[model samples]
Target: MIVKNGEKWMDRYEIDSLIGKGSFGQVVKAYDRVEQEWVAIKIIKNKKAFLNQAQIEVRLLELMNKHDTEMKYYIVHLKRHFMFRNHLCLVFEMLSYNLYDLLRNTNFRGVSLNLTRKFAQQMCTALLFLATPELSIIHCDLKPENILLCNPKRSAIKIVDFGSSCQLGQRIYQYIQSRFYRSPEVLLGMPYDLAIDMWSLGCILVEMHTGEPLFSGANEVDQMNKIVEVLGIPPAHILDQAPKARKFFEKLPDGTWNLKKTKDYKPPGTRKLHNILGVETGGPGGRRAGESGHTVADYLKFKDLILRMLDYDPKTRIQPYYALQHSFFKK
Candidate 1:
């Protein structure tokens, strides 16, 4: 249900062209005539469930914008919403290409540690804002693909596609977040909260520096194994709390949790983040051979911050306030 270019919606917004399309349905670039500015319109599918979900998105976006009047937290600003053709249409400030597209454009060579630092700083601050006691928003689907640059040449970015986001204490979905960045508690069918976004930020930062997904899992079990490959197994106490732990891990005669079917799953904890970065050559990530920011010191700083962010236990996972102060963000 898309209108052609120059067609007007709600009389004042003229359709430009479709900018994106997927499960939520089509996204069009439209011209807001009275404001004389370009905008993005997400056209939700014409169905009840989709409408309900989008309604939630609109509510959350409004709450987010309400508190972030200064736009300092890196969340996209939604201008308004209205129904068109019986479809929920959301209007938002137009944004630049997503970080994944940036990676693709660079041929996945990854960016400099400086670039990663710039991205990480804003990300941490944004999460800190989300973790505010008043809001407690859980960005349920955080990923590089969902982070869009505000300008192609700028380090600033805004988090988008909050359709799956949930306010804490009333989270209603178990199927949250993508596979690669999934947190241990979430994968094991335990309660998940704001820390899941930190876990995703860690995964995203690693990929931003390495030009490859840190954990490229083939399935749920594979995803867990891949995480274990780098971070060791989830703590026994945390595993014991998970009702679904048995699906991928076993309760050994001893108290420890072990993988139920570990056949060459990269020998749990053998893969090293240090080796992945290879700071000596600065090989995996971006910047030329003599470029400054890929030094061993920088890599270690980044690795340490990522480890804290990727902690298996949500209770222990680094939160935004402390993460914002991490050395990785310093010059």
Candidate 2:
């Protein structure tokens, strides 16, 4: 159903504007007459599968809300949910623009280290909360678009879009995460877990610093190539576990593998993370162009964290709690 401005839903919300649209539903900035505040109301498409997914998302939000006292600072707060005209409507506290918008407003040049530190810590805190046994929520998609600033000053941000979230250890979908942010394990059809989110977080945090995707691949093949170019080839044992590894790699007599499509492929020389982020190699007091108030020591610490978060072995990837406690966040 098409929702227009001025439309009333359940006699409580008056649609003010269409804020966002997706395959399964659309969100509107609505005025909550009862509460005298603005809120975001997501109206799910009228379809069985979409409705079911919407219900699941609502349940997840409810579970998160159950611990709002501890999670309120990081997670988006769900205000209410109901069915209106055969549509599942989820009301959320209205928030400011997303991280992507902030990135764009800066002309895609990225944010300062101070701001990056703030956003990164908040994200880690949220993910750590989600990692709890009771929650164990894996946010299948973690990109700048899904992280919103809570206010105009952009002092705080929250993770949004739980529609693609799943319980830990649950493999409901094979294809997850956006192309650039997709984890290596998921792309290779290997069994994946919450660590996939960590990989995406690494990508997101890097993008926040550089204003570009760490792996901007055009297709699955290109995606693997991008990763290999930066991270080098995965260990043979790890590759052997990927169901689609054969499609992209060929085993050699020397117990090594080569790209099946790109003949005579040579792995790009590894670029240090500080260099990729445009930071100089000098010590703690050094600074580079476009960077301010960030020392070489700070960049090195941040790079170290990203490397662990993006580890090829999911089992070895840095857990959210550990990431939160990393020295990169300590400053």
Candidate 1 on 247-317: residue-level lDDT in tens? 78888878888888754466778898877777666547325466777777887888889889988889989
The per-model lDDT (C-alpha) reads 0.85, 0.83
Model 1: how far is 251 from its true place, Å? Answer: 1.6
Candidate closest to the true structure, highest TM-score: 1
Supply every candidate's count of residue pairs whose N, Cα or C atoms clash at under 3 angstroms. Answer: 0, 0
Off by over 4 Å in 2: 263-271, 281-291
Candidate 1 lDDT trough over 10 residues, lowest sum: 279-288
The residue-by-residue lDDT of candidate 2 on 1-331, one tens digit each, is 8788898876888899989899878989999989999999888998998998788789888888787556546888889898888898889999999888888987877777777788888888888888878888888989999999899875789898888888977668888899999998999888777788889999999888777788988998888888887888777888878898886778899878776766432364374566676557432123344445577678778888989988989989999888888998874
- Check candidate 1 and list the clashing pairs: none
* Candidate 1 positional error at 219, Å: 0.9
